[PDB]
Amino acid sequence: SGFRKMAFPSGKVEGCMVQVTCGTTTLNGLWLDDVVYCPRHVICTSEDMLNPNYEDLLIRKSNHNFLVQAGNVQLRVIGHSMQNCVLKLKVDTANPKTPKYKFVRIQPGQTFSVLACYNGSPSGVYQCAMRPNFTIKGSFLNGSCGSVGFNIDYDCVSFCYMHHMELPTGVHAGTDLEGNFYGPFVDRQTAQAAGTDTTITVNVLAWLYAAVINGDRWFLNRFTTTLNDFNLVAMKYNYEPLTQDHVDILGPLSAQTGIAVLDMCASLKELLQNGMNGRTILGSALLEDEFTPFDVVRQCSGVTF
């Protein structure tokens, strides 16, 4: 037993990370088959990023202006193309370590693992959630651009995130692997409003089920509630409204524990209105919303890849 914030094993992605250099700028790229993917602002200087015209900047670049290095292996760039906010560099060698993979655009509230990289070399791996406002709260220093987020299902890596920017507020923004930003953000060094965030209610409930499975039960209470009653509390505390689709996704955990979803909602209602009184749940003194229902089922059942 025990419950930890657990990332996917990163080895399949490690073998895809490369360094991309264009003039003065170096960041990370993702090498799959004979294409390297990276943020298009690799072609920008310091000053360019205040108001870049990417089409004009890319026109001044030729294939031989992109230096791509896989460890010590040098790749030969034989084509380049911009797709939305990503650059696609065609190289003359297929990555021998390419895993089975898909590109996916995830929904807010879903989770993924980030492999943080600098200069094409991996430094660490952690799990996080796409916030309702399409930011992520990561750990990204200068040079981490191009690091990717992903999920793994048995032998297939689903890439869902490429890191592009740190907002002045310190939170992080990026794109899917077709170069479309999550949220309203643009790849320009300007003030950008993220907009009100909310707590991912269905994830909090999943985590409460995980707590019960692991023996933390003090928050189980005498009350029940209705979906409409609970949603009145959710709005007051800036929680996402709970829908029947969410109730359905929690079905398997309700079945395993014998605790009806609306009874767990009444526990969550009391925690919101009364706090935790200085107690903890799964080692936390706040309500945790970065585990999805599938994440909880995975960890409680030992799913492997």
Next chain:
Amino acid sequence: SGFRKMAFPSGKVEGCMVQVTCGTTTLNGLWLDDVVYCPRHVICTSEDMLNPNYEDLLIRKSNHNFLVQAGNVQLRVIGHSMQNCVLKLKVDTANPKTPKYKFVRIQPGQTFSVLACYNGSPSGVYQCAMRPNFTIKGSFLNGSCGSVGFNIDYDCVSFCYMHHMELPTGVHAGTDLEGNFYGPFVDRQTAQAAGTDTTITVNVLAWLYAAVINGDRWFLNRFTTTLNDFNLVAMKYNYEPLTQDHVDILGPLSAQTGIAVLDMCASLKELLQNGMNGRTILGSALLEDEFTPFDVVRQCSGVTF
């Protein structure tokens, strides 16, 4: 910026995990050069674990009784030996994916990454600390025995932990890679007292420095303290005593932030005596003690491997 609980990239260890089967029992092994390492209780049945005589149980086993499977590759066992609480199975093939590696015995309060595995297949990776009482608070389901913990320094994997047991209290115990348990524990299904745990004071201070670096400063206060004064508070709150060696290890973080260690101690004193008043620090409502000073420097400087 941002600060996350970050695990090491697990790819170098993934390539070493194998499945070990002896009769009815299957768990994980670690394949390095031509030796596979695994918990010796792979030779035990359900009933054996109440009071096993491992020497007698191993004598009834021959090389061909150990089935070792690396993915789909079958390894041939050509020798076996017990070392303390680990079994060493000599195989006829050197692991082509063996990384540069060392075996190390870590000290209480140090951190490492765990690659949780089932049936020889990796499922996830997370960071944790060796508690002062030599337990770890992990996520380990049935079949996870033999999963390992490790640190990486550039290209060298330092293996420090092999998982063996879940105590009836739900915390986890294991050995170094020479098979010596951390703490007083034995590989027998019996009640085993872990003994009083304490909070790793030098790690809490490191994490407070990480908070200041990332802009969380509300806990910085007007006071200072002495080492002896602070240690009187530490004992009252079940914190490890702070020594000059700990002060010295925090030197680089004190230098970067300009905050003397004893001034940060006075902040920590006030947090212990007054709580957090419902505020948070780096997203946490409790004092975090699973980051070492080296962990904080690594993440704040982008160290890579």
